[PDB]
Every structure is written in C-alpha cells, then in structure tokens.
Amino acid sequence: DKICLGHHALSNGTKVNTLTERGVEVVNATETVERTNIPRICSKGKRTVDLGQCGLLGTITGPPQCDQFLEFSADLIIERREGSDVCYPGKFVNEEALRQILRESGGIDKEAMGFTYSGIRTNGTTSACRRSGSSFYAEMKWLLSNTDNAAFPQMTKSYKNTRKSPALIVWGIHHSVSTAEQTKLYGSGNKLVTVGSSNYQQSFVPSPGARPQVNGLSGRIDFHWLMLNPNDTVTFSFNGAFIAPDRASFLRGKSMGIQSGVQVDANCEGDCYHSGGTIISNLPFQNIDSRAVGKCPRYVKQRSLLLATGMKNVPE
C-alpha cells in the first residue's frame, strides 16, 4: 500500500552552534580549534642550531660559551633560558632589534677587519671570560694604553665593506669601576669615541662608577652596532675606553628564530612553534598560544568550535 521516505539518526548526537541556535544536535561534527601540543621542537629536515648556554648576541662577540657558534648556519635557531650573551658583565644597545636580525639571518659568516695597532696594548683579558685562565671576547680586542696611567693616543681606524651584502659591525665601550681605574687603563682626560657611516652618526663618552658585582665583577661593557652597506666605509675615532672589533659578521640567508624550554626532536616535522613545543595541525584555528610563530593556525580565545558534518539529529 505505501512507500516511506526518511533519514538516518542516532539516539544521541553532537551539539553545535548555528546563527539561530546554541547547542543543536547533529549527526556528526568535527573540531576546528587545535588544542593538541607536541611538547618538543619538531625539527625534522631542518638545519637546526640549539644555542643552549650561548646567547644569540654572543655569537657576534664570542664569549667562551659561544665559541662553537661563531660562524653557525641554520634554518631554525633556538634560544634557551640559560643562554647568556656576555662573559664580562655588559649589555647591548638596541639589543632586541639585533636579535630579530640574527634570528632570521640563516646564521653568520665572519671576516677579518684588518685593523692594525701601534702605540697601544691590545690583549686585555679578565677572570670572567674563562678559557683555561683569563681571556676575552673572541671577536673583540680590549684596547688599552701601553702602560699604567699612560696616554691613549687619539686614533682613527677605517673599514670599507667590499662585499655585496650589509656588514654587521660591533664595538664596545668599557665603563671601569672607578674614575681612577679609567685613568689607569687609558690615561686621564674625558675620552670620546665617534662613529660614522653614510646613514649613521653617533658619539660615545664613557661613565666610570660602581655597579653591583655581576660574575664577581663591578665593571661593565656597553656593546653597540650598525649595518654597514656594500661599498660604504665606517670610521672609528677614539681616545680610549674602546673594545675593538676584530671581525665583521655577514648574514648567510634565511632562518626562523624561536625561544623554547623543550627538547629538539628530528622525528616529527612542524612549522608552528611556541615555547612549550610544536603545533602540528591542519585546522584553521588554535587555542594553545597566541605568541606561536612560524606558519600557524590563527590563535583564538575559544577552546572549541565544532563544525557540523552531518544533518540535524532527530531521534525517535
């Protein structure tokens, strides 16, 4: 007598939201917000450099913890909490700009400045910088006066960038513990260091005085930098208190830089990283970490957003 039409159903369905309604039950649904973290840096197939105790900015100056990173090469650069940029207490002027440059550099290649010195000492070391006895930043030279209290002769040194890419140049200003200890090292009088590239003009007068003991030492070194263009020249006029660059750094290509406290893992591949590991997902959204970097799903505040993949569930 009759033929009936109908559709499939479950007794119990999956709740979703629509334009009109909260929590309507459908036959099937799928998650659109990723919550699964891999607690590891997934670096399969990527030239990876884990800096460990070496600070990223330390790769340009060369404290002992960074001796194996002076000319590194990488697609992925991992900074660690224990990493330190310095041996002898100090810090970088404009530090985070330089980090951002180095994170995406693809690593660094180093080259001799060609500076030659006459009338001054050039081998100043310290107990903070340890390589079987006292040492100093590998890429730098602590310039001094020939003898104690002696005059530091006003000096001019120049470096032309003869290569096709920008040269990262770094120099340091030493701030000694006393007004006396500045005079001991570089002689009396107020000392002046100046720097000039086509698109750069700045000057540096020191400031002796007592800072608290870091690494057992109350002295500080300021570090500065500029990017010297192809064919441009940079001149260092200095009367003392100067940490001279021995080498110049050039950037190799491209890379991605991350900060993390989890282990490296060459068994999983991923392009979305945060400090707690890797987000591996094809979902368009993620609720794991808003500061995730690389190629990531978009961060959203919602924990979950289910997308209906079936009809409305209408049980008997």
Partner 1 sequence: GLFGAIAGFIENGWEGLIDGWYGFRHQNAQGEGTAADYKSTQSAIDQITGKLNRLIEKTNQQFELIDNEFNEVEKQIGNVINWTRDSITEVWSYNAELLVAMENQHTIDLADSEMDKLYERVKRQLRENAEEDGTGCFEIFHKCDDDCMASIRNNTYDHSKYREEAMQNR
Ligand X SMILES: CC(=O)N[C@@H]1[C@@H](O)[C@H](O[C@@H]2O[C@H](CO)[C@H](O)[C@H](O[C@]3(C(=O)O)C[C@H](O)[C@@H](NC(C)=O)[C@H]([C@H](O)[C@H](O)CO)O3)[C@H]2O)[C@@H](CO)O[C@H]1O
Ligand Y SMILES: *[C@@H]1O[C@H](CO)[C@@H](O)[C@H](O)[C@H]1NC(C)=O
Q: List binders of partner 1 among 228-267 (CB under 8 A).
A: 256-259
Q: Does 94 bind a second copy (CB under 8 A)?
A: no
Which of 65, 105, 176, 259 binds ligand X (CB under 6 A)? It is 176
CB 85 within 8 A of CB 219: no
Q: What does the per-residue mask of binding to partner 1 show for 21-40, with x meaning CB under 8 A? A: xx-x-x---x-xx-------
Q: Which is nearer to ligand X, 26 or 155 (CB)?
A: 155
192 binds a second copy (CB under 8 A): yes
**What is the spatial distance between Cα 38 and Cα 40, in angstroms, rounded to a whole number?**
6
Site string for ligand X, 130-169 (x = CB under 6 A): ----x-------x-x-------------------------
Cα-only R_g, the chain: 29
103: helix, coil or strand?
Answer: helix
Q: Determine, following the binding rule CB under 8 A, whether residue 30 of this chain makes contact with a second copy.
A: no
Q: How far apart are CA 58 and CA 72, in angstroms?
A: 12
Q: Does 123 bind ligand Y (CB under 6 A)?
A: yes
Breaks in the chain (C–N > 2.5 Å) following residue? none
Q: Which amino acid is at 101?
A: I
User: Per CB under 8 A, does 213 bind partner 1?
Assistant: no
Maximum distance among all Cα pairs of the chain, rounded to whole angstroms = 118
| Alpha-carbon dihedral sign for residues 83, 87, 91, 95 | negative
94: left (phi over 0), alpha (psi -120 to 50) or beta: left
Minimal distance in Å, beta carbon 226 to ligand X?
22
CB contact set of 22 (below 8 Å; sequence gap of 6+): none
Region binding ligand Y by CB under 6 A among candidate stretches 6-14, 193-201, 207-215, 280-288:
6-14
- The site for ligand X (CB under 6 A) is made up of 124-127, 134, 142, 144, 176-177, 181, 185, 216-217, 219
Site of interaction with ligand Y (CB under 6 A) = 10, 12-14, 28, 30, 121, 123, 230-231, 309
